[PDB]
Amino acid sequence: TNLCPFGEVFNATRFASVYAWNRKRISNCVADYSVLYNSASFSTFKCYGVSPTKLNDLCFTNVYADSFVIRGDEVRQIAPGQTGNIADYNYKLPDDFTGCVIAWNSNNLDSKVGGNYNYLYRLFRKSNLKPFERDISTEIYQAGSTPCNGVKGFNCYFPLQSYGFQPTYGVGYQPYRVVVLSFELLHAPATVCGPK
Amino acid sequence: QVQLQESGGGLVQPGGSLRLSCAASGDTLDLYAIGWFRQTPGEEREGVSCISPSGSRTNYADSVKGRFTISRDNAKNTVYLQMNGLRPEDTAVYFCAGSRPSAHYCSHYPTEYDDWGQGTQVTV
Ligand SMILES: *[C@@H]1O[C@H](CO[C@H]2O[C@H](CO)[C@@H](O)[C@H](O)[C@@H]2O)[C@@H](O[C@@H]2O[C@H](CO)[C@@H](O)[C@H](O)[C@H]2NC(C)=O)[C@H](O)[C@H]1NC(C)=O
């Protein structure tokens, strides 16, 4: 009977930085995905392995909603098999992803006239993330052969960089809020079904 | 993802008409929005018209409002752009592009589209 708390995910006042992407477990509730899809709200609503209007027919043990903010021209990296700073170092989907990627322009919420420096992304990392891996460390990144002794300096960079989101002409540079839905089946009774 | 191919471009006298076609191969168009963009030499692509996956929302740039009409045929997996009252300002390479947004969404923003055609030349 209880509707799934999608409002808390999509309409959260604050969204996470992509390097510190949030995960919310959805369980024991009724999910209406078609109400989300049958709207003018989302500039990306891409599902992998399933059509969006078929989700209401299925039942899962849990649903996970991962959410964060990136640039509009980075939304393309939130897909299987992509590369670039976001896919490589911030949020990585597996090659065999089944699930949905939902995005919408959040300029009015997340940009500031002088720039919103609270949203960050990881620019440097010793290796690429594995799928669904998360890295929130802030150790100084050693880009050369001199060790950094935990202090930024020559070839020693703080690994996170700010987006500084501003209300620009091109929407590609504006912030977009992203929700990634993934659907989990365990050897256990389902707890998240569509309407009857 | 689809592959898109534009057709129907060519030379036209000022005041005439053209009907561009955007044929999709691979996927069906059921889940795709389609947008029409144009690009003059050395310039940036200007969104001109779009249609949502549902076909319920069509948006037009102010420069073409009233003279251009976009439409979709899911059975043929083709989207059309009817161009009436063509002025020499409308001369450009015309591209169609595809995206998978929510059912009633479509924009004129190039960065919100994934799949692009090669374009066809319209000369007024
Ligand atoms: C996210 O929130 C939007 C907007 O919510 C506004 O209206 C609701 C009433 O539902 C109000 O409680 C809230 O404080 C805001 O003022 C939701 O979009 C609205 O949804 C209602 C139905 O629930 C529709 O009647 C409105 O037309 C619609 N408006 C817009 C602009 O979309 C949306 O459903 C919420 N998303 C989720 C996932 O819960």
Author numbering:
A (entry chain E): 333 to 528
B (entry chain B): 1 to 124
What text appears in the publication on this structure?
Here, we report on the identification of a special group of nanobodies from immunized alpaca with potency against diverse VOCs including Omicron subvariants BA.1, BA.2 and BA.4/5, SARS-CoV-1, and major sarbecoviruses. To search for broadly neutralizing antibodies, we decided to use immunized alpaca with RBD and spike protein of SARS-CoV-2, as this animal species, like those in the family of Camelidae, encode a small single heavy chain nanobody (<15 kDa) with one variable domain (VHH) that are able to reach regions otherwise inaccessible by conventional human antibodies. We determined crystal structures of 1-2C7, Nb70, and 3-2A2-4 bound to the recombinant RBDs. In summary, we have demonstrated distinct mechanisms of three nanobodies (1-2C7, Nb70, and 3-2A2-4) in competing with ACE2 thereby in neutralizing SARS-CoV-2.
1-2C7 bound to the SARS-CoV-2 Beta RBD (SARS-CoV-2 Beta-RBD) was resolved at 1.8 Å resolution whereas the structure of 3-2A2-4 bound to the SARS-CoV-2 wildtype RBD (SARS-CoV-2 WT-RBD) was solved to 2.4 Å resolution. Seven residues in the 1-2C7 epitope (Y369, N370, S375, T376, F377, K378 and P384) and nine in the Nb70 epitope (Y369, F377, K378, C379, Y380, G381, V382, S383 and P384) were also part of the CR3022 epitope. However, as 1-2C7 approached its epitope from the the receptor-binding motif (RBM) and the epitope deviated upward relative to that of CR3022, it was expected to create steric hindrance to ACE2. Y369, S371, F374, F377, K378 and Y508 in the RBD interacted with 1-2C7 through hydrogen bonds and salt bridges. As 1-2C7 had steric clash with ACE2 upon binding to the RBD, 1-2C7 likely exerted its neutralizing activity through direct competition with ACE2 for binding to RBD. Among the viable mutants tested, 1-2C7 was mostly affected by single S371F substitution, followed by S371L, S373P, and then G339D. The triple mutations S371L/S373P/S375F resulted in complete loss of activity to the degree that was compatible to BA.1, BA.2, BA.2.12.1, and BA.4/5. As expected, 1-2C7, strongly competed with ACE2, regardless with or without Fc tail. 1-2C7 acts through direct competition for binding to RBD.
